[PDB]
């Protein structure tokens, strides 16, 4: 005699609330903030303020060479 029973359920719908293009106020922020954005994206936090800013743009240019848009016909 044992606990013989079977039943399982689950559901999950794709929601909205989405990012996209990088912050255009990189120059307006602090060097530390740029180094923060870099480290989280596996980027080196070495160079000067302008270097870090343009390195963020260079990263974007690789992962998505567009002005901020989904690289596929979808949401």
Swiss-Prot record:
Top-level taxon of the source organism: Eukaryota
Localization: Cytoplasm; Nucleus
Segments forming domain SAP: 26-60
Entry comment describing in which tissues the protein is expressed: Ubiquitously expressed, has been detected in lung, placenta, small intestine, liver, kidney, spleen, thymus, colon, muscle, heart and brain. Expressed in peripheral blood mononuclear cells (at protein level).
Phosphoserine, modified sites: 64
UniProt function note: Transcription coactivator that associates with the serum response factor (SRF) transcription factor to control expression of genes regulating the cytoskeleton during development, morphogenesis and cell migration. The SRF-MRTFA complex activity responds to Rho GTPase-induced changes in cellular globular actin (G-actin) concentration, thereby coupling cytoskeletal gene expression to cytoskeletal dynamics. MRTFA binds G-actin via its RPEL repeats, regulating activity of the MRTFA-SRF complex. Activity is also regulated by filamentous actin (F-actin) in the nucleus.
Record text on subunit structure and interactions: Interacts with SRF, forming the SRF-MRTFA nuclear complex which binds the 5'-CArG-3' consensus motif (CArG box) on DNA via SRF. Interacts (via RPEL repeats) with globular actin (G-actin), thereby regulating its subcellular location and activity of the complex formed with SRF. Either forms a trivalent (by binding three G-actin monomers) or pentavalent (by binding five G-actin monomers) complex with G-actin. Forms a nuclear ternary complex with SCAI and SRF, leading to suppress MRTFA-induced SRF transcriptional activity.
Domain description: The N-terminal region is required for nuclear localization and the C-terminal region mediates transcriptional activity. The RPEL repeats mediate binding to globular actin (G-actin); each RPEL repeat-binding to one G-actin monomer. In addition, each intervening spacer sequence region can bind one G-actin monomer, to reach a pentavalent complex.
Disease: A chromosomal aberration involving MRTFA may be a cause of acute megakaryoblastic leukemia. Translocation t(1;22)(p13;q13) with RBM15. Although both reciprocal fusion transcripts are detected in acute megakaryoblastic leukemia (AMKL, FAB-M7), the RBM15-MRTFA chimeric protein has all the putative functional domains encoded by each gene and is the candidate oncogene. Immunodeficiency 66: An autosomal recessive primary immunologic disorder characterized by recurrent viral infections from infancy, associated with impaired neutrophil migration due to defects in cytoskeletal actin dynamics.
The protein's name in its UniProt record: Myocardin-related transcription factor A
UniProt source species: Homo sapiens (Human)
Parent-record interval covered: 336 to 396 of 931
